[PDB]
Amino acid sequence: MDHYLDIRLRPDPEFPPAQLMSVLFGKLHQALVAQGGDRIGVSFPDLDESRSRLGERLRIHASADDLRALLARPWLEGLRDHLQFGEPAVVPHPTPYRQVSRVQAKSNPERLRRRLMRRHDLSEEEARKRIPDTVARALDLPFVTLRSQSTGQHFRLFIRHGPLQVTAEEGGFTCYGLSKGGFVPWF
């Protein structure tokens, strides 16, 4: 947790930087499943909240032993074109801590209608009148578009930074690097 590694997106004359990090964020998700462990954190140093811009720099926080196996995994092959990596250096001592959360949205009224068919056996018109089409949730927050091996449906995963606190909380991390109760340094 004390060590951090900085990743910045080398600009591409063929892809926008938004498409490059979606590959990067999907590849780091597969790192946590195969390697294991719930102590790998992520942060966005250049997160501009004015227009929900993710920026061009990605920061990963983990321990020294976990980061050594992170770079030793051959997932860096095929991604050295678009990125360069620094060194697993330590975080500064006066760094306030903030949390991250994966906030999903109920954007599809039809999907929730298909959910309640197998639980209450309601009709198509019954679900339409009970749940209208205005229940869709629009989030003005940064997000990533990915694809999974288990489910081929493309999903938009919103990434949100929480309030900046004065201390960190001991907690685990999700497979995407998001926090289920943990905190990451901010600098």
Binding site: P11, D12, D81, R147
Partner: protein, 298 residues
């Protein structure tokens, strides 16, 4: 006065074919004969076209045929005969200084790594490219390369990389026919979704005959991505050789006309004021000559 001709069309050398795709498995690529091709199917999400590999497949099967014709200094449609003549000896002195040595080597780098798999190389952990030289109907000499060793930013040197140098430069000089069949194999994943060329149901994916394929001009742009003499700031990599250095990914066009490094002024300066540009700067000029254009005075 030797002014620029009104029409200055140049033929397109380095002809690429329509790069079809097919699905297969790794460690079976030696039998590259009869894999079934990925077919574009219709799915509802608004309805858009989607291309997916079958369950028992994780690599691509991009095939296309490349031709090196030569005579890039000869314009097909030139308004002025005297201005046509000056471009003929101007590129003739360029051949005498170097026999297309650097251009063919950087053309070899494009043909070595599978950069022409735009989306299918970024998410691939293992890419292999098979190159065959077909003469008279038989493979005169074959190649087996790897896109991982040859990076897309740095231009390294290899003995087998130099093997394509004398083959391409001989064709570009105009000493004989060069026919190369390029076969690619990139491990994008089991059933991973692929982005082929998209046609214009909001979005339509391209196909030729019950098989997904890539446009000829789509393969060509990656093969022209050798321009590194542009004013590279922010760590940008090689760009496609275009007039006025335009790249639409960033939305900004490098090699601005206000300075003396675009294709139009450098070619004009070479043949009108008759002072040669730099060796590094003139490498970009003939690179636009080989690809052709609709150049000329308006």
């Amino acid at each position: 006065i030797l002014s620029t001709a009104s029409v200055l069309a140049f033929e397109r050398k380095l002809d690429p074919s329509d790069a079809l795709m097919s699905a297969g498995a790794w460690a079976q690529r030696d039998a590259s004969q009869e894999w079934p091709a990925v077919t574009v199917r219709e799915k509802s999400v608004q309805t858009v076209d989607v291309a997916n590999l079958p369950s028992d497949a994780d690599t691509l099967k991009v095939r296309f045929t490349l031709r090196v014709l030569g005579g890039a200094g000869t314009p097909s449609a030139c308004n002025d005969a005297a201005y046509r003549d000056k471009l003929l000896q101007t590129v003739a002195t360029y051949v005498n200084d170097q026999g297309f040595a650097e251009l063919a080597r950087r053309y070899a780098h494009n043909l070595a790594n599978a950069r022409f798999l735009w989306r299918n190389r970024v998410g691939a952990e293992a890419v292999e490219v098979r190159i065959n030289h077909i003469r008279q109907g038989e493979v005169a000499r074959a190649w087996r390369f790897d896109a991982l060793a040859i990076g897309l930013r740095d231009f390294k040197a290899d003995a087998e990389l130099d093997a394509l140098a004398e083959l391409i430069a001989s064709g570009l000089s105009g000493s004989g026919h060069v026919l190369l069949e390029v076969v690619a194999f990139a491990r994008i994943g089991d059933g991973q979704e692929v982005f082929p060329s998209q046609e214009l149901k909001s979005k339509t994916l391209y196909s030729v005959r019950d098989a997904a394929a890539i446009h000829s001009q789509k393969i060509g742009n990656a093969l022209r991505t050798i321009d590194t003499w542009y004013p590279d700031e922010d760590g940008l990599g090689p760009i496609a050789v275009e007039p006025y250095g335009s790249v639409t990914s960033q939305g900004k066009a490098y090699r601005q006309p206000k300075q003396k490094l675009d294709f139009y002024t450098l070619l004009d300066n070479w043949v009108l004021r008759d002072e040669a540009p730099a060796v590094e700067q003139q490498h970009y000029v003939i690179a636009n000559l080989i690809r052709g254009g609709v150049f000329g005075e308006a």
